[PDB]
Amino acid sequence: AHAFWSTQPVPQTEDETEKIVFAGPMDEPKTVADIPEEPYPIASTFEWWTPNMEAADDIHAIYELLRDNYVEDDDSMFRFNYSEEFLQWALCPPNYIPDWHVAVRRKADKKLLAFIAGVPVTLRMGTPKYMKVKAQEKGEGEEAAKYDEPRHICEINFLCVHKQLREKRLAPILIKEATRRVNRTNVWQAVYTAGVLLPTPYASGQYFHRSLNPEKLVEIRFSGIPAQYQKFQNPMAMLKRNYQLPSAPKNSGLREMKPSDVPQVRRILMNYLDSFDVGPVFSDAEISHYLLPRDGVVFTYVVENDKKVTDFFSFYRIPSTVIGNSNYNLLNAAYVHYYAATSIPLHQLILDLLIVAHSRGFDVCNMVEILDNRSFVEQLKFGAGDGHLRYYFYNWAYPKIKPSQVALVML
Ligand SMILES: CCCCCCCCCCCCCC(=O)SCCNC(=O)CCNC(=O)[C@H](O)C(C)(C)COP(=O)(O)OP(=O)(O)OC[C@H]1O[C@@H](n2cnc3c(N)ncnc32)[C@H](O)[C@@H]1OP(=O)(O)O
Ligand SMILES: O=C(Cc1ccc(F)cc1)Nc1cc([C@H]2CN(C(=O)C[C@H](O)Cc3ccc(Cl)cc3)C[C@@H]2CO)ccc1Cl
Ligand SMILES: [Mg+2]
């Protein structure tokens, strides 16, 4: 059934997955020395390309490939339109490896045809807590703790094959060449997410959306007026009323994050993420990179009364193309990013997120049910969307966990 994934070091069935009790590798340990020096052979009409992310033109080429060919919703009404500034931020964290950005171009004109990207991430990915309890009961605590230390691995994103090249098994070649490049740096695990079912996820979660401009959402058919609203004389006016927000934040102390907050946000964030089974470990340079505000891309606010950062939240922006509306070209969506609350309840912190996003002209706020995102879905009037996001490892055996035990946000 899976000619490519059946040759790879991943759990092959949910049964396979059910028998996993400890984290650790799937494969045979290998060395850099064992891995072929040369790129994987490709058809003579194509060529491998490593784009330079410091070069405006190379970012622009990847931006056009994704603008026209990347992920669409299931009804083909919307397609993600990551900006060039977003791609530079996502693709180039501190100590990124330029060789992990893998492209295929057509030789005859240098047209970009396929892309995949890897970035370094440091991830806690040891045995989950529930499985450590079961281990203690069996007397098997040392095996359970072997891979407890944060690991330097690759996070894969942005796999995209041009529409004209679909179903020609081009995706497997990209994945194998990315794997070769990552392995040649002595990294043997990757983490990736997808909104498709592949062999075989370690967690799965629903998407959630919070309307901020319901009249536009209904006009572009992101949203429907629900049936229940028909009992009203003016269904749309009641819908707008239901989702209305304050103009200004409720928490005094709220202000944009600035560089001097980095150490305190790193502290409160790392203390929070600690509670989760799978989650990233960020250095000060990484906190700086992923959280300091960047126009049009990432927005971060802290709660500081009496000169101490006690809470913060962040969100990032991705516009989507609206495929053929006379009125609207773009859906401007905000995505919940990392956050930590130590002094106020999380629903009150995220309410300020929604108020900030609405004030800045976003149409909808989106999130996956990771972190503690469930604790605020009802009060903050989030609705479950369609389908599920699945989380995967490459070359890592891992027990199934709940999405509330996952703390890695994928951009
Ligand atoms: C240690 C280092 C390791 C680093 C690598 C780690 C692994 C990283 C894995 C990648 C993580 C990506 C994370 C993201 O970015 S998820 C976002 C993926 N991108 C899109 O959905 C954008 C639109 N779609 C496309 O561009 C194409 O349809 C893609 C590229 C998805 C497939 O192109 P195409 O339609 O032309 O298909 P094909 O004939 O070439 O190939 C068919 C084979 O590909 C398998 N397939 C289909 N969809 C996915 C998918 N989303 N992840 C993994 N595999 C997928 C499929 O099951 C089949 O295998 P098998 O069933 O025959 O066995
Ligand atoms: O925005 C939507 C709805 C939507 C689907 C398709 C569209 F064209 C526009 C909107 N879904 C949605 C998507 C995400 C994030 C999940 N996500 C990933 O897991 C990264 C993956 O490597 C690629 C991927 C991209 C998009 C999706 Cl939907 C699923 C997988 C990127 C997405 C943006 O950061 C987080 C929360 C929600 Cl509600
Ligand atoms: Mg193909």
Short mmCIF file of C-alpha atoms and ligand atoms in Angstrom, two decimals:
data_model
loop_
_atom_site.label_atom_id
_atom_site.label_comp_id
_atom_site.label_asym_id
_atom_site.label_seq_id
_atom_site.Cartn_x
_atom_site.Cartn_y
_atom_site.Cartn_z
CA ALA A 1 0.00 0.00 0.00
CA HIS A 2 2.98 2.36 0.63
CA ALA A 3 5.77 1.67 -1.79
CA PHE A 4 7.90 4.48 -0.30
CA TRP A 5 6.97 4.56 3.42
CA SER A 6 7.30 0.82 3.76
CA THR A 7 11.07 1.11 3.05
CA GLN A 8 11.57 3.80 5.78
CA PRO A 9 12.45 3.65 9.48
CA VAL A 10 9.02 4.46 10.83
CA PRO A 11 6.33 2.33 12.66
CA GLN A 12 4.32 0.68 9.93
CA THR A 13 0.94 0.13 11.57
CA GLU A 14 -1.00 1.24 14.60
CA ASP A 15 -0.37 -2.32 15.96
CA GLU A 16 3.37 -1.81 15.64
CA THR A 17 2.81 1.48 17.48
CA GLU A 18 0.69 -0.14 20.23
CA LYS A 19 3.68 -2.45 21.13
CA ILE A 20 6.07 0.52 21.65
CA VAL A 21 6.90 1.09 25.27
CA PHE A 22 10.19 3.07 25.19
CA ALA A 23 11.47 5.96 23.07
CA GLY A 24 14.50 5.28 20.93
CA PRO A 25 15.67 4.79 17.44
CA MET A 26 14.07 2.45 14.87
CA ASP A 27 17.16 1.84 12.77
CA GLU A 28 20.66 0.49 13.08
CA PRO A 29 23.14 3.01 14.36
CA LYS A 30 25.25 4.30 11.32
CA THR A 31 28.02 6.87 10.80
CA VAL A 32 28.49 9.83 8.61
CA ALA A 33 31.22 7.79 6.86
CA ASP A 34 28.61 5.16 5.74
CA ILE A 35 26.47 7.76 3.96
CA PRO A 36 27.02 8.40 0.21
CA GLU A 37 28.92 11.64 -0.50
CA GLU A 38 27.12 12.45 -3.65
CA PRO A 39 23.51 13.58 -4.15
CA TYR A 40 20.98 10.99 -4.86
CA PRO A 41 20.74 10.22 -8.59
CA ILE A 42 17.94 12.32 -10.31
CA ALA A 43 16.50 12.42 -13.92
CA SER A 44 18.87 14.26 -16.26
CA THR A 45 16.27 16.96 -17.06
CA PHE A 46 16.29 18.10 -13.36
CA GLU A 47 19.04 19.27 -11.02
CA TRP A 48 19.48 19.65 -7.31
CA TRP A 49 19.61 23.24 -5.98
CA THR A 50 20.45 24.61 -2.52
CA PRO A 51 18.82 28.03 -2.29
CA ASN A 52 20.63 30.83 -0.42
CA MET A 53 18.14 32.15 2.17
CA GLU A 54 20.21 35.39 2.51
CA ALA A 55 19.42 36.16 -1.11
CA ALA A 56 16.15 38.00 -1.79
CA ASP A 57 15.80 36.28 -5.22
CA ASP A 58 16.14 32.78 -3.92
CA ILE A 59 13.53 33.51 -1.16
CA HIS A 60 11.31 34.94 -3.86
CA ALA A 61 11.49 31.81 -5.99
CA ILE A 62 10.49 29.56 -3.05
CA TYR A 63 7.70 32.05 -2.20
CA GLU A 64 6.21 31.71 -5.71
CA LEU A 65 6.39 27.93 -5.74
CA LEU A 66 4.52 27.77 -2.39
CA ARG A 67 2.07 30.60 -3.30
CA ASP A 68 0.85 28.55 -6.34
CA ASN A 69 1.33 24.98 -5.20
CA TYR A 70 1.36 24.60 -1.43
CA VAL A 71 -1.34 23.33 0.99
CA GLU A 72 -5.01 24.12 0.17
CA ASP A 73 -8.06 23.48 2.26
CA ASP A 74 -10.07 20.41 1.32
CA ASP A 75 -12.57 22.35 -0.85
CA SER A 76 -9.81 24.13 -2.79
CA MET A 77 -11.14 27.49 -1.70
CA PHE A 78 -8.02 28.73 0.11
CA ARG A 79 -4.30 28.12 -0.31
CA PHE A 80 -1.62 29.23 2.13
CA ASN A 81 0.41 32.28 1.03
CA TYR A 82 3.44 32.45 3.33
CA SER A 83 5.19 35.76 2.85
CA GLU A 84 8.84 36.16 1.90
CA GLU A 85 9.59 37.70 5.29
CA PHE A 86 7.88 34.76 6.95
CA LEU A 87 9.91 32.23 4.97
CA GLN A 88 13.20 33.93 5.89
CA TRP A 89 12.20 33.80 9.62
CA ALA A 90 11.04 30.19 9.48
CA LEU A 91 13.92 28.81 7.32
CA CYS A 92 16.80 30.61 9.11
CA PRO A 93 16.84 30.23 12.91
CA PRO A 94 20.22 30.54 14.66
CA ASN A 95 22.72 27.94 13.44
CA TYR A 96 20.47 26.79 10.67
CA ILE A 97 22.15 24.54 8.09
CA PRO A 98 21.87 25.91 4.57
CA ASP A 99 22.39 22.40 3.05
CA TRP A 100 19.14 21.23 4.68
CA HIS A 101 17.09 23.45 2.34
CA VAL A 102 16.67 21.10 -0.65
CA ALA A 103 15.23 22.11 -4.03
CA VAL A 104 14.79 20.63 -7.51
CA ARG A 105 14.93 22.89 -10.52
CA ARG A 106 14.39 22.15 -14.23
CA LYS A 107 17.78 22.50 -15.96
CA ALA A 108 16.44 24.06 -19.19
CA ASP A 109 15.18 27.29 -17.46
CA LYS A 110 16.04 26.93 -13.76
CA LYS A 111 12.26 26.90 -12.82
CA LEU A 112 11.73 25.72 -9.23
CA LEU A 113 9.81 22.48 -9.22
CA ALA A 114 10.03 20.99 -5.75
CA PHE A 115 11.21 22.04 -2.30
CA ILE A 116 11.67 20.65 1.19
CA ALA A 117 13.21 22.27 4.18
CA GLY A 118 14.79 21.10 7.38
CA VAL A 119 15.75 23.28 10.40
CA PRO A 120 17.59 22.37 13.55
CA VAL A 121 15.54 21.89 16.65
CA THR A 122 16.45 20.64 20.14
CA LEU A 123 13.58 18.45 21.36
CA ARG A 124 12.76 16.55 24.49
CA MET A 125 11.49 13.24 23.06
CA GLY A 126 12.26 10.70 25.75
CA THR A 127 9.76 8.24 27.08
CA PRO A 128 6.41 9.78 27.87
CA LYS A 129 5.35 10.07 31.55
CA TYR A 130 2.45 7.58 31.38
CA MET A 131 4.84 4.98 29.96
CA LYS A 132 7.46 5.82 32.62
CA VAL A 133 4.86 5.00 35.35
CA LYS A 134 4.16 1.67 33.59
CA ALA A 135 7.88 1.10 33.40
CA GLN A 136 8.41 1.67 37.13
CA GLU A 137 5.64 -0.96 37.77
CA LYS A 138 7.63 -3.46 35.69
CA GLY A 139 10.99 -2.60 37.21
CA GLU A 140 12.16 -1.10 33.86
CA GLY A 141 12.94 2.54 34.73
CA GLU A 142 16.49 2.64 33.37
CA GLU A 143 15.52 1.54 29.84
CA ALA A 144 12.60 4.08 29.94
CA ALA A 145 15.13 6.99 30.74
CA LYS A 146 17.91 6.24 28.30
CA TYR A 147 16.87 8.96 25.75
CA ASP A 148 15.68 11.56 28.31
CA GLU A 149 18.31 14.21 27.33
CA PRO A 150 17.20 16.85 24.76
CA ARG A 151 18.24 15.73 21.27
CA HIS A 152 19.55 17.87 18.33
CA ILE A 153 17.31 16.76 15.47
CA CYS A 154 15.72 18.16 12.23
CA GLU A 155 12.20 19.64 11.92
CA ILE A 156 10.98 19.19 8.32
CA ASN A 157 8.45 21.63 6.74
CA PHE A 158 7.45 23.07 3.42
CA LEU A 159 7.44 19.90 1.27
CA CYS A 160 5.95 21.01 -2.05
CA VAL A 161 5.89 19.51 -5.54
CA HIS A 162 4.73 21.76 -8.39
CA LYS A 163 1.21 20.88 -9.59
CA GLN A 164 2.49 19.73 -13.01
CA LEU A 165 4.76 17.17 -11.40
CA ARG A 166 2.33 15.52 -9.06
CA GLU A 167 2.10 11.71 -8.69
CA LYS A 168 5.43 11.15 -10.35
CA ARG A 169 7.11 9.90 -7.09
CA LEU A 170 9.07 13.11 -6.85
CA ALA A 171 8.20 13.53 -3.13
CA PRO A 172 10.10 10.31 -2.14
CA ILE A 173 13.24 11.53 -3.97
CA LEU A 174 13.09 14.87 -2.07
CA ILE A 175 12.61 13.06 1.23
CA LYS A 176 15.53 10.69 0.52
CA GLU A 177 17.88 13.46 -0.47
CA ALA A 178 16.85 15.54 2.63
CA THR A 179 17.47 12.52 4.80
CA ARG A 180 20.95 12.07 3.17
CA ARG A 181 21.84 15.74 3.82
CA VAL A 182 20.64 15.59 7.45
CA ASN A 183 22.47 12.26 8.06
CA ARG A 184 25.76 13.73 6.57
CA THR A 185 25.59 16.18 9.57
CA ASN A 186 25.22 13.37 12.02
CA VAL A 187 21.54 13.81 12.71
CA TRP A 188 19.39 10.71 12.57
CA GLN A 189 15.86 11.76 13.75
CA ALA A 190 13.34 14.25 12.31
CA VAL A 191 9.94 15.49 13.49
CA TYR A 192 7.27 16.55 10.99
CA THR A 193 3.54 17.11 10.91
CA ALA A 194 0.94 16.60 8.16
CA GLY A 195 -2.79 16.94 7.73
CA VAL A 196 -2.73 13.53 5.94
CA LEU A 197 -2.52 10.03 7.46
CA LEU A 198 0.90 8.39 6.88
CA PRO A 199 2.66 5.54 8.66
CA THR A 200 2.41 6.28 11.59
CA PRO A 201 1.60 9.27 13.88
CA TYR A 202 2.52 9.50 17.56
CA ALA A 203 -0.25 12.08 18.25
CA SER A 204 -3.21 13.61 16.43
CA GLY A 205 -5.23 16.71 17.23
CA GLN A 206 -8.12 18.74 15.86
CA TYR A 207 -7.75 22.23 14.44
CA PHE A 208 -9.66 25.10 16.02
CA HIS A 209 -10.68 28.54 14.67
CA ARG A 210 -12.02 31.67 16.32
CA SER A 211 -13.87 34.12 14.14
CA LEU A 212 -12.70 37.71 14.51
CA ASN A 213 -14.45 39.20 11.33
CA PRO A 214 -17.43 36.92 10.86
CA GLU A 215 -19.01 38.94 8.03
CA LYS A 216 -15.85 38.50 5.84
CA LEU A 217 -15.53 34.78 6.84
CA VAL A 218 -19.06 34.14 5.69
CA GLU A 219 -18.55 36.10 2.43
CA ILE A 220 -15.46 34.01 1.49
CA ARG A 221 -17.15 30.81 2.68
CA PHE A 222 -14.50 30.08 5.37
CA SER A 223 -17.60 29.99 7.58
CA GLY A 224 -21.32 29.45 7.15
CA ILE A 225 -24.06 31.18 9.11
CA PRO A 226 -25.02 28.13 11.21
CA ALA A 227 -28.61 26.73 10.93
CA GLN A 228 -29.52 27.88 14.51
CA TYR A 229 -29.04 31.50 13.56
CA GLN A 230 -32.11 31.29 11.20
CA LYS A 231 -34.55 31.58 14.08
CA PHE A 232 -33.36 35.23 14.14
CA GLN A 233 -34.77 38.15 12.29
CA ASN A 234 -31.22 39.22 11.42
CA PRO A 235 -28.89 36.13 11.45
CA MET A 236 -25.75 38.05 10.50
CA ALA A 237 -26.18 40.82 13.01
CA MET A 238 -26.52 38.21 15.76
CA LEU A 239 -23.40 36.44 14.45
CA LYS A 240 -21.33 39.64 14.60
CA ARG A 241 -22.64 40.24 18.10
CA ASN A 242 -21.68 36.73 19.27
CA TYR A 243 -18.00 37.25 18.20
CA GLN A 244 -17.48 40.91 19.10
CA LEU A 245 -14.39 41.73 21.24
CA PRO A 246 -13.17 44.71 23.31
CA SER A 247 -11.07 47.38 21.45
CA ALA A 248 -8.31 47.22 23.98
CA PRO A 249 -6.61 44.66 26.25
CA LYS A 250 -8.08 44.01 29.68
CA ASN A 251 -4.76 43.32 31.47
CA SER A 252 -2.86 46.48 32.41
CA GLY A 253 0.77 45.56 32.23
CA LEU A 254 0.31 44.27 28.61
CA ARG A 255 2.94 45.56 26.20
CA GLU A 256 4.99 44.25 23.21
CA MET A 257 7.98 42.10 24.08
CA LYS A 258 11.41 43.69 23.66
CA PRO A 259 14.93 42.28 23.66
CA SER A 260 15.49 42.87 27.35
CA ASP A 261 12.62 40.42 28.12
CA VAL A 262 14.36 37.46 26.45
CA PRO A 263 15.87 35.91 29.62
CA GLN A 264 12.58 36.07 31.63
CA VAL A 265 10.43 34.78 28.70
CA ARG A 266 12.93 31.97 28.19
CA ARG A 267 12.66 31.08 31.90
CA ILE A 268 8.80 31.09 32.15
CA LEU A 269 8.44 29.34 28.77
CA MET A 270 10.98 26.58 29.52
CA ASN A 271 9.39 26.01 32.98
CA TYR A 272 5.98 25.67 31.28
CA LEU A 273 7.06 23.41 28.38
CA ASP A 274 8.71 21.15 30.90
CA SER A 275 5.31 19.75 31.81
CA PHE A 276 4.92 18.20 28.30
CA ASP A 277 6.26 14.93 26.92
CA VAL A 278 7.49 16.19 23.52
CA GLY A 279 8.64 19.83 23.40
CA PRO A 280 11.46 22.10 22.26
CA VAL A 281 14.34 23.49 24.36
CA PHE A 282 15.15 27.04 23.30
CA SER A 283 18.39 28.95 23.91
CA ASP A 284 18.25 32.76 24.47
CA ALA A 285 19.19 33.22 20.70
CA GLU A 286 16.31 30.90 19.75
CA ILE A 287 13.84 32.74 22.05
CA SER A 288 15.04 35.96 20.40
CA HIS A 289 14.61 34.60 16.95
CA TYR A 290 11.19 32.93 17.36
CA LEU A 291 9.51 35.41 19.73
CA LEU A 292 10.80 38.93 19.26
CA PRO A 293 8.22 40.86 17.24
CA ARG A 294 8.71 41.03 13.48
CA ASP A 295 6.42 43.11 11.34
CA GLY A 296 3.92 41.18 9.41
CA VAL A 297 5.25 37.87 10.76
CA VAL A 298 5.27 37.28 14.51
CA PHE A 299 3.64 39.31 17.31
CA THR A 300 4.56 38.83 21.00
CA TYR A 301 3.25 40.55 24.13
CA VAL A 302 4.26 40.23 27.74
CA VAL A 303 2.45 40.99 30.98
CA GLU A 304 4.73 42.98 33.19
CA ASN A 305 3.55 44.71 36.30
CA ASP A 306 6.32 45.73 38.79
CA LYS A 307 9.16 45.19 36.26
CA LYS A 308 8.80 41.35 36.13
CA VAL A 309 7.52 39.41 33.08
CA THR A 310 4.94 37.02 34.55
CA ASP A 311 2.98 36.00 31.43
CA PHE A 312 3.34 36.28 27.66
CA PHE A 313 1.71 35.13 24.44
CA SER A 314 2.75 35.11 20.76
CA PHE A 315 0.99 34.53 17.47
CA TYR A 316 2.17 34.54 13.88
CA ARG A 317 0.47 35.58 10.64
CA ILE A 318 -0.11 33.57 7.45
CA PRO A 319 -2.41 34.99 4.83
CA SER A 320 -4.24 32.61 2.52
CA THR A 321 -5.23 33.17 -1.01
CA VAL A 322 -8.99 33.08 -1.50
CA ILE A 323 -9.37 31.24 -4.82
CA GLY A 324 -11.81 33.47 -6.88
CA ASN A 325 -13.97 35.85 -4.76
CA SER A 326 -15.07 39.09 -6.49
CA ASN A 327 -14.71 40.90 -3.14
CA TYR A 328 -11.74 39.39 -1.30
CA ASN A 329 -8.28 38.37 -2.34
CA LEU A 330 -6.83 37.32 1.07
CA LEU A 331 -7.79 35.70 4.41
CA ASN A 332 -5.56 37.25 7.09
CA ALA A 333 -5.17 34.52 9.76
CA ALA A 334 -3.42 34.66 13.13
CA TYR A 335 -2.03 31.39 14.59
CA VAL A 336 -1.53 30.83 18.28
CA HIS A 337 2.17 30.33 18.91
CA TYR A 338 3.85 29.80 22.32
CA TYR A 339 2.62 31.30 25.57
CA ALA A 340 2.99 30.93 29.35
CA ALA A 341 0.83 32.14 32.16
CA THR A 342 2.04 32.24 35.76
CA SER A 343 -0.10 34.98 37.26
CA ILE A 344 -3.44 34.97 35.39
CA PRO A 345 -5.70 32.23 34.06
CA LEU A 346 -4.89 31.17 30.53
CA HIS A 347 -8.35 32.11 29.18
CA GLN A 348 -7.79 35.69 30.31
CA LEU A 349 -4.28 35.81 28.63
CA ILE A 350 -5.60 34.43 25.35
CA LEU A 351 -8.55 36.79 25.38
CA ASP A 352 -5.92 39.53 25.15
CA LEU A 353 -4.41 37.66 22.20
CA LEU A 354 -7.76 37.74 20.36
CA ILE A 355 -8.27 41.39 21.17
CA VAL A 356 -4.83 42.27 19.89
CA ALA A 357 -5.25 40.23 16.71
CA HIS A 358 -8.67 41.73 16.03
CA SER A 359 -7.39 45.29 16.56
CA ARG A 360 -4.63 44.58 14.02
CA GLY A 361 -7.04 43.52 11.32
CA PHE A 362 -6.90 39.69 11.41
CA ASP A 363 -10.00 37.82 10.28
CA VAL A 364 -9.62 34.54 12.27
CA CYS A 365 -7.39 33.04 14.96
CA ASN A 366 -6.34 29.39 14.48
CA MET A 367 -4.65 26.76 16.61
CA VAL A 368 -4.23 22.95 17.04
CA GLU A 369 -5.29 21.27 20.31
CA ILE A 370 -1.67 21.00 21.64
CA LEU A 371 -0.20 22.68 24.73
CA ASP A 372 -3.18 23.75 27.03
CA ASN A 373 -5.13 25.01 24.06
CA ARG A 374 -8.22 22.96 25.19
CA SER A 375 -8.58 24.91 28.39
CA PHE A 376 -9.80 27.94 26.57
CA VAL A 377 -11.75 26.64 23.52
CA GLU A 378 -15.26 26.97 25.07
CA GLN A 379 -14.99 30.28 26.83
CA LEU A 380 -13.14 31.94 23.96
CA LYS A 381 -15.70 30.61 21.37
CA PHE A 382 -13.24 28.53 19.32
CA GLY A 383 -14.86 25.95 17.04
CA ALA A 384 -13.29 22.67 15.85
CA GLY A 385 -12.41 22.78 12.14
CA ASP A 386 -12.22 19.97 9.61
CA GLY A 387 -9.85 16.99 9.92
CA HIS A 388 -6.80 16.54 12.16
CA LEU A 389 -3.10 17.42 12.28
CA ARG A 390 -0.87 14.36 12.83
CA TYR A 391 2.61 14.48 14.38
CA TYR A 392 5.31 12.09 13.26
CA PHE A 393 8.90 11.16 13.93
CA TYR A 394 11.40 9.78 11.45
CA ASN A 395 13.63 7.00 13.01
CA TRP A 396 12.11 7.25 16.41
CA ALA A 397 10.04 4.73 18.08
CA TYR A 398 7.54 6.45 20.27
CA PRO A 399 4.37 5.45 22.38
CA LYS A 400 1.14 7.09 21.27
CA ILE A 401 0.44 10.23 23.29
CA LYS A 402 -2.48 12.65 23.65
CA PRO A 403 -2.06 16.03 21.81
CA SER A 404 -2.18 17.77 25.12
CA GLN A 405 1.26 16.19 25.84
CA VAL A 406 2.72 17.88 22.73
CA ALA A 407 4.39 21.34 22.99
CA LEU A 408 6.04 21.70 19.55
CA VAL A 409 4.34 24.34 17.33
CA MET A 410 4.88 23.69 13.62
CA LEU A 411 4.97 26.79 11.36
C1 LIG B 1 16.81 12.15 9.79
C2 LIG B 1 16.39 13.12 8.69
C3 LIG B 1 15.02 12.71 7.99
C4 LIG B 1 14.38 13.91 7.22
C5 LIG B 1 13.13 13.43 6.39
C6 LIG B 1 11.99 13.05 7.36
C7 LIG B 1 10.66 12.69 6.63
C8 LIG B 1 9.92 14.03 6.18
C9 LIG B 1 8.59 13.61 5.53
C10 LIG B 1 7.97 14.79 4.79
C11 LIG B 1 7.24 15.62 5.88
C12 LIG B 1 6.48 16.75 5.16
C13 LIG B 1 5.77 17.72 6.11
C14 LIG B 1 4.90 18.63 5.26
O1 LIG B 1 5.51 19.61 4.73
S1 LIG B 1 3.18 18.34 5.12
C15 LIG B 1 2.75 19.45 3.68
C16 LIG B 1 2.96 18.67 2.42
N1 LIG B 1 2.71 19.57 1.31
C17 LIG B 1 1.52 19.74 0.71
O2 LIG B 1 0.51 19.11 1.10
C18 LIG B 1 1.51 20.78 -0.41
C19 LIG B 1 0.69 20.21 -1.63
N2 LIG B 1 1.01 18.89 -2.09
C20 LIG B 1 2.15 18.56 -2.71
O3 LIG B 1 3.01 19.45 -2.93
C21 LIG B 1 2.35 17.15 -3.12
O4 LIG B 1 1.11 16.49 -3.12
C22 LIG B 1 3.25 16.37 -2.09
C23 LIG B 1 4.64 16.92 -2.06
C24 LIG B 1 2.72 16.36 -0.65
C25 LIG B 1 3.30 14.92 -2.52
O5 LIG B 1 3.72 14.84 -3.87
P1 LIG B 1 2.81 13.96 -4.89
O6 LIG B 1 1.36 14.03 -4.63
O7 LIG B 1 3.34 14.36 -6.23
O8 LIG B 1 3.13 12.45 -4.48
P2 LIG B 1 4.38 11.56 -5.07
O9 LIG B 1 3.98 10.62 -6.19
O10 LIG B 1 5.54 12.37 -5.39
O11 LIG B 1 4.70 10.65 -3.79
C26 LIG B 1 3.73 9.85 -3.16
C27 LIG B 1 4.34 9.35 -1.87
O12 LIG B 1 4.44 10.51 -1.00
C28 LIG B 1 3.72 10.23 0.14
N3 LIG B 1 3.15 11.50 0.67
C29 LIG B 1 2.03 12.20 0.24
N4 LIG B 1 1.88 13.31 1.05
C30 LIG B 1 2.90 13.27 1.95
C31 LIG B 1 3.29 14.15 2.97
N5 LIG B 1 2.54 15.26 3.24
N6 LIG B 1 4.36 13.84 3.77
C32 LIG B 1 5.08 12.73 3.49
N7 LIG B 1 4.78 11.90 2.45
C33 LIG B 1 3.69 12.15 1.70
C34 LIG B 1 2.64 9.25 -0.30
O13 LIG B 1 2.10 8.69 0.93
C35 LIG B 1 3.44 8.39 -1.22
O14 LIG B 1 4.24 7.44 -0.51
P3 LIG B 1 3.81 5.88 -0.55
O15 LIG B 1 2.53 5.94 0.21
O16 LIG B 1 3.78 5.58 -2.02
O17 LIG B 1 4.78 5.13 0.38
O1 LIG B 2 -5.24 27.34 8.84
C1 LIG B 2 -5.80 26.23 8.79
C2 LIG B 2 -7.05 26.14 7.89
C3 LIG B 2 -6.57 26.28 6.47
C4 LIG B 2 -6.25 25.17 5.69
C5 LIG B 2 -5.77 25.39 4.39
C6 LIG B 2 -5.68 26.73 3.96
F1 LIG B 2 -5.25 27.04 2.75
C7 LIG B 2 -5.98 27.84 4.73
C8 LIG B 2 -6.45 27.59 6.00
N1 LIG B 2 -5.37 25.12 9.47
C9 LIG B 2 -4.40 25.20 10.44
C10 LIG B 2 -3.00 24.93 10.16
C11 LIG B 2 -2.07 25.07 11.18
C12 LIG B 2 -0.59 24.86 11.03
C13 LIG B 2 -0.24 23.38 10.94
N2 LIG B 2 0.95 23.34 10.10
C14 LIG B 2 1.78 22.29 10.05
O2 LIG B 2 1.55 21.28 10.73
C15 LIG B 2 3.06 22.35 9.24
C16 LIG B 2 3.10 21.19 8.25
O3 LIG B 2 4.47 20.84 7.94
C17 LIG B 2 2.44 21.49 6.90
C18 LIG B 2 0.93 21.67 7.03
C19 LIG B 2 0.41 22.92 6.64
C20 LIG B 2 -0.92 23.18 6.71
C21 LIG B 2 -1.79 22.20 7.22
CL1 LIG B 2 -3.53 22.64 7.37
C22 LIG B 2 -1.28 20.98 7.68
C23 LIG B 2 0.10 20.71 7.56
C24 LIG B 2 1.19 24.63 9.41
C25 LIG B 2 -0.07 25.40 9.70
C26 LIG B 2 0.20 26.94 9.73
O4 LIG B 2 1.16 27.21 10.74
C27 LIG B 2 -2.50 25.48 12.48
C28 LIG B 2 -3.89 25.67 12.76
C29 LIG B 2 -4.78 25.55 11.70
CL2 LIG B 2 -6.57 25.85 11.83
MG MG B 3 5.63 13.65 -8.04
#
